[PDB]
Design a protein around this ligand. Sequence first.
Ligand SMILES: CC(=O)N[C@H]1[C@H]([C@H](O)[C@H](O)CO)O[C@@](O[C@H]2[C@@H](O)[C@@H](CO)O[C@@H](O[C@H]3[C@H](O)[C@@H](O)[C@H](O)O[C@@H]3CO)[C@@H]2O)(C(=O)O)C[C@@H]1O
Ligand SMILES: CC(=O)N[C@H]1[C@H]([C@H](O)[C@H](O)CO)O[C@@](O[C@H]2[C@@H](O)[C@@H](CO)O[C@@H](O[C@H]3[C@H](O)[C@@H](O)[C@H](O)O[C@@H]3CO)[C@@H]2O)(C(=O)O)C[C@@H]1O
Ligand SMILES: CC(=O)N[C@H]1[C@H]([C@H](O)[C@H](O)CO)O[C@@](O[C@@H]2[C@@H](O)[C@H](O)O[C@H](CO)[C@@H]2O)(C(=O)O)C[C@@H]1O
Lengths: 205, 205, 205
Amino acid sequence: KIDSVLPPLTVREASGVRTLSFGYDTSDFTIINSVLSLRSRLTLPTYRYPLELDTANNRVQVADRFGMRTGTWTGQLQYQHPQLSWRANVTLNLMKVDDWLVLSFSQMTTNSIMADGKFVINFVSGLSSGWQTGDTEPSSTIDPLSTTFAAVQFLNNGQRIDAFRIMGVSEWTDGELEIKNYGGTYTGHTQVYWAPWTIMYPCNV
Amino acid sequence: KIDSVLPPLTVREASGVRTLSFGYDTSDFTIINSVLSLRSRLTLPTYRYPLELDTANNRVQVADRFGMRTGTWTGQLQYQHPQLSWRANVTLNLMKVDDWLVLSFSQMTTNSIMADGKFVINFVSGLSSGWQTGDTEPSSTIDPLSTTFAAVQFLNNGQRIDAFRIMGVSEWTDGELEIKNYGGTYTGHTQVYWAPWTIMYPCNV
Amino acid sequence: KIDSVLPPLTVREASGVRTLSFGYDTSDFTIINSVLSLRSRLTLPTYRYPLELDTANNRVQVADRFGMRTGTWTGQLQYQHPQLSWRANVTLNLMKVDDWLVLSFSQMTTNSIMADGKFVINFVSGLSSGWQTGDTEPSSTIDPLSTTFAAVQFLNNGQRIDAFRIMGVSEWTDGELEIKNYGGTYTGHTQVYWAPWTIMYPCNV
Ligand SMILES: CC(=O)N[C@H]1[C@H]([C@H](O)[C@H](O)CO)O[C@@](O[C@H]2[C@@H](O)[C@@H](CO)O[C@@H](O[C@H]3[C@H](O)[C@@H](O)[C@H](O)O[C@@H]3CO)[C@@H]2O)(C(=O)O)C[C@@H]1O
Ligand SMILES: CC(=O)N[C@H]1[C@H]([C@H](O)[C@H](O)CO)O[C@@](O[C@H]2[C@@H](O)[C@@H](CO)O[C@@H](O[C@H]3[C@H](O)[C@@H](O)[C@H](O)O[C@@H]3CO)[C@@H]2O)(C(=O)O)C[C@@H]1O
Ligand SMILES: CC(=O)N[C@H]1[C@H]([C@H](O)[C@H](O)CO)O[C@@](O[C@@H]2[C@@H](O)[C@H](O)O[C@H](CO)[C@@H]2O)(C(=O)O)C[C@@H]1O
């Protein structure tokens, strides 16, 4: 039947007995259970967010949402001072940009404030869909995480007086974000007009 | 002749017939068009920017430009108010840091301004090489995207008066960036000296 | 002995002699030194920081420290002006967030200052463990890299006068960071109370 044999196939006549064998690369293959098997089958790694595998085009990429994720918080902005405290209905815009959380305040009119004080935002409830309270937790306990200025107008018996307020992100406790108002320029007033302002802090959730 | 046969190769006599055959692992291989073929050939993924494959060292990395990309815009800064509007020749420095665009203003001397108003930057033309107009488009329509303060000196005509201006990134339309000046401290003046200032906004291009 | 063969094996006959041969997918395999060898052995890429391979779960991810790395600098904050200069003992908090370096100043009381001037931070020494001087080098030479406002109180014979100071990150030279105080509101004073403030600049180290 079989006259000759071509590689990988070879016939070795050792001890007057002709034996047929299959030749293979030792580092590539191995015989297990009397079959040709691959030595070291390479398993492809998985990817943790913000890295993702686009299975449709077999491409690894940074998730789009990582650069920008929007949301809103609806609740009551709490002003706190031992001698004066109030609640104002606000809706603030939120945006996750990389490892930062940005809060955007639109203009607002509030009751009067003391020379210094605290603003508290309770994220326990009020977040738009897709957002969890934990998503607003800062990635550091350093105080302050960031400071910004808010431009205001103090209303005092008809006259509008331009001033500023310095605001610092200082604490986060069980979903309550605390923004300290260290001070700034001040005058006796009845009401405050706040121009829009943004504040951001590190957040890796 | 052929006396013996070593694995993967095996001989089986069944139904008075002796048939030789090649022994293979069924999860590693198969037979396609009567030849040994690999089952499940693993294809290596490609990478979308800012991820890149350094082919020279077979290493996946984040592109260097992602952390920092510089540029300049040369044009006319437009101040807009219904009762007053002007154009000033400026060159502002630009830097792309991750998913942020930073605009850096050098000191400047401009005509007088109203208590509030708009600054417009037309990116349709004026960008340095490598930059396209689309590269300045914000990644969100939230208003404001960011706010900052600019320190100014109002020339009363006899005296130089220190004040501030609050600036907010508010809109981008077909290459025109709009920076609103909500207000701040103010006095009657002939001209404005602006100290340097920076403003940044989210941008994922 | 051997009655017949089966695929991959074939016994083809030509030119008067019958020969046994092994069949293979020519794209998948080849013969090298008369042995079955695979073509195109896939080599897995390595990863450059902030990308890393979690070997335990065979997963590629962004390093945790990339989003947040804390530290402290302890030294003397140097104020510089041709007609006045001093040194104050400070400890400032530092945080690396992505490609940004954030400096956090706690409240401080310093000696009096001129209408404008420079603040210098010498990172050559004073950094907490894990931090090198090179880690504070900006990723661009643009001036200013960033500006912020500091809220101050000018102390002049017991009276406290609220004002602001504009601060810009302007230069880094051999470990010395320079923060220019372009100006802001001012009055004659003997000492300055500074509210807390943060400033950040691009840094890809
Ligand atoms: C940060 C923020 O949420 N800013 C709002 C603020 C604050 O909610 C508020 O001033 C804090 O004290 O209010 C602004 O005006 C809105 C406010 O007056 C509410 C009160 O009901 O009405 C909104 O519009 C109403 C309108 O009053 C109705 O007559 C109408 O039928 O429906 C509208 C629904 O929107 C005001 O826009 C403010 O500028 O003071 C808007 C800020 O965005
Ligand atoms: C943001 C920005 O671009 N700031 C510039 C500003 C503004 O261009 C300007 O003040 C807006 O009104 O100008 C600063 O000064 C430059 C300005 O006066 C221009 C006017 O020609 O000249 C520049 O230097 C010239 C110099 O005037 C010529 O005599 C000389 O032959 O060439 C020089 C270089 O072209 C001024 O630097 C300003 O300080 O207000 C500089 C800002 O960076
Ligand atoms: C940024 C910083 O390090 N801030 C410190 C600050 C400065 O060290 C200092 O005021 C610069 O002049 O000091 C603070 O605390 C002070 C002590 O450092 C000082 O030894 O004693 C002071 C009272 O006698 C004061 O308590 C401050 O000014 O509050 C603390 C701050 O974090």
